Design a protein around this ligand. Structure first.
Ligand code: F6P
Lengths: 310, 287
């Protein structure tokens, strides 16, 4: 079947305040390129058609940028169908608005609109579909985590989720955000590896039942609430990547981390000189030390660009 | 017969930027404007013009013009119709080498990295044009130039290249092996390109190249199409004494032969050339 995606193009945490006041925190440029133009390109790299884009906060800028972007032309094999409504206050309202409209009819990718990644969801998607027909809707989601190391700039110490995973079947048994914590409480009912080297990366591959599981239980608001509230009750599994980058841009710290990772070519098909958005005003030449200079830059005399300059 | 030399000196006077061989072409073409004895007259013009300048370029640039016109005489023969097809073909040849330095600059200025530091010998109106096109493409570099005794042409080049706002250093003539590690690439202008692809340039070019291959610095030569001379030296003695000498004992040769193994590329008029490729072109320029 065709692969769909839901792209929540309004992050519902008031996190980039006051930069979110004058530009939406999905349209602010990462490395001369808006964040959505990464995640949209990400979905186009995955093999995604029908990438629904949900905009609530300042949808005028987002829609007027999307229609002048690469993926709104008919040449793109990733149709968008921007859904604009002010009713959404959280991700729960977005996935509840998926129902009563039935936009998804197979398993879909739920990126959160500011993801930046070169992940290939074909191994993970085929593993998800393999244990979806096999156990007859036991699984509802397949979270995508990056095999990180806990002392990394990309790990903000504001997400840092620890999980308890059954290593033979990759099922997530426990999940909690370790924002303020020194010792981690794991209940003994889940008896089984316990992993902290997992960058969250927010590329869940949730089946349409998840959109069902957000509507009947109206109390949910976000994906963290969903994973916590269903691991107490219908089986979130996971897939861990090691050779591909993935991280969203939740706050301005991890903005700096992901922008320094993109410049240093960690997201290799999405380097600034690749010009993955086909704009004429963003061409570059990767010179020697990840020094990219655009067209007609006119560097001065005696100025030194040491490394990682765009 | 004597006004020929006067006109050639005049073409030097009201055009110093014009090459010596092109001046020979122009004065010989005017002499052409004044059957098969006319070929003998043009050969006498070659002899008298080479007798007063003695550069390789003059006795080669004029010698291709003895062949670029005699190629048309292979197609057809006449008495005054052949003279007019000679003048409309020679004018084409002459206006096709007025564009030589620009083509060489367009090919060669892409070989200079940004922030490079080139090393050049005495004074070339082609190397100067390569650097003039390289600063017009917003590249910034450093130029090392040897003063290149006895006529101190390096100081003339550095005075002619300081107007381009380039950091230029008039290094001592002996200090090529010293600053040679401070050089990313070597650009010299040949006074003649011999049949094996090597060059004949002002004295000191050879030891610039021998140091270059000692440190694997690329040695680029920017010659022109009319400088392709048919000589084949095997050592520095095999260069004729016509070309070496312009006139406790002094020696003073003025040119020396650079072996083709020392040359990385030639940026001639007719495209970028491997040193081997030159030989083919010479065959094509003389059938
Ligand atoms: O570039 P030009 O002026 O035609 O001559 C090139 C070479 O001939 C000389 O002017 C004389 O040998 C050298 O200074 C130079 O390297």
């Amino acid at each position: 079947p065709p692969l769909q995606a839901v792209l929540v193009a309004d992050s519902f945490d008031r996190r980039f305040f006051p930069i979110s006041k004058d530009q939406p925190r999905v349209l602010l440029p990462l490395a001369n390129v808006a964040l959505i133009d990464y995640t949209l390109e990400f979905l186009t790299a995955t093999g995604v058609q029908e990438t629904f884009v949900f905009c609530c906060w300042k949808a005028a800028q987002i829609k007027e940028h999307l229609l002048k972007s690469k993926w709104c032309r008919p040449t793109s094999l990733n149709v968008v169908r921007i859904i604009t409504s002010e009713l959404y206050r959280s991700l729960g309202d977005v996935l509840r608005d998926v129902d009563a409209k039935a936009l998804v009819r197979s398993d879909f990718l739920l990126v959160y609109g500011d993801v930046i990644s070169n992940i290939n969801i074909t191994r993970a998607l085929e593993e998800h579909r393999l244990r979806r027909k096999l156990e007859k809707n036991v699984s509802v989601m397949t979270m995508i985590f990056k095999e990180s190391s806990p002392s990394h700039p990309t790990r903000c110490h504001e997400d840092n989720v620890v999980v308890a995973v059954d290593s033979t079947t990759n099922r997530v048994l426990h999940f909690q955000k370790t924002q303020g914590l020194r010792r981690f409480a794991f209940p003994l009912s889940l008896f089984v590896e316990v992993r902290y080297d997992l960058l969250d990366c927010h590329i869940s591959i949730c089946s349409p039942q998840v959109a069902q599981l957000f509507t009947d239980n109206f109390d949910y608001q976000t994906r963290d609430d969903f994973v916590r509230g269903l691991l107490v009750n219908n089986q979130i599994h996971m897939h861990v990547t090691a050779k591909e980058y993935g991280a969203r841009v939740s706050n301005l710290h991890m903005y700096s981390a992901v922008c320094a990772d993109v410049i240093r070519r960690w997201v290799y098909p999405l380097t600034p000189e690749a010009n993955f958005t086909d704009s004429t005003t963003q061409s570059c030449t990767h010179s020697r030390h990840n020094i990219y200079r655009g067209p007609e830059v006119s560097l001065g005399h005696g100025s030194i660009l040491e490394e990682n300059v765009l | 017969d004597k006004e020929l030399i006067e006109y050639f000196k005049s073409q030097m006077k009201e055009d110093p930027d014009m090459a010596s061989a092109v001046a020979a072409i122009r004065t010989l073409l005017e002499f052409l404007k004044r059957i098969q004895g006319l070929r003998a007259n043009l050969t006498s013009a070659i002899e008298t013009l080479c007798g007063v300048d003695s550069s390789v370029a003059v006795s080669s640039g004029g010698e291709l013009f003895l062949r670029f016109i005699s190629l048309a005489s292979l197609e057809y023969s006449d008495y005054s119709k052949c003279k007019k097809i000679m003048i409309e073909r020679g004018e084409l040849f002459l206006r096709r080498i007025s564009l030589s330095r620009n083509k060489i600059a367009d090919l060669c200025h892409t070989f200079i990295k940004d922030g490079a530091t080139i090393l050049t010998h005495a004074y070339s109106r082609v190397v100067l044009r390569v650097l003039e096109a390289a600063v017009a493409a917003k590249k910034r570099f450093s130029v090392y130039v040897t003063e290149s005794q006895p006529d101190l042409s390096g100081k003339k080049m550095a005075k002619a290249l300081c107007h381009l706002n380039v950091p230029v250093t008039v290094v001592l003539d002996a200090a090529v092996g010293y600053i040679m590690e401070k050089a990313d690439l070597v650009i010299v202008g040949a006074e003649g390109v011999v049949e094996n692809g090597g060059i004949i340039n002002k004295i000191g070019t050879n030891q610039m190249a021998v140091c270059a291959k000692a440190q694997n610095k690329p040695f680029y030569v920017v010659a022109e199409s009319f400088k392709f001379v048919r000589l084949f030296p095997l050592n520095q003695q095999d260069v004729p004494d016509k070309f070496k000498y312009k006139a406790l004992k002094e020696e003073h040769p003025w040119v020396d032969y650079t072996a083709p193994s020392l040359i990385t590329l030639l940026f001639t008029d007719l495209g970028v050339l491997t040193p081997s490729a030159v030989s083919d072109e010479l065959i094509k320029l003389y059938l």
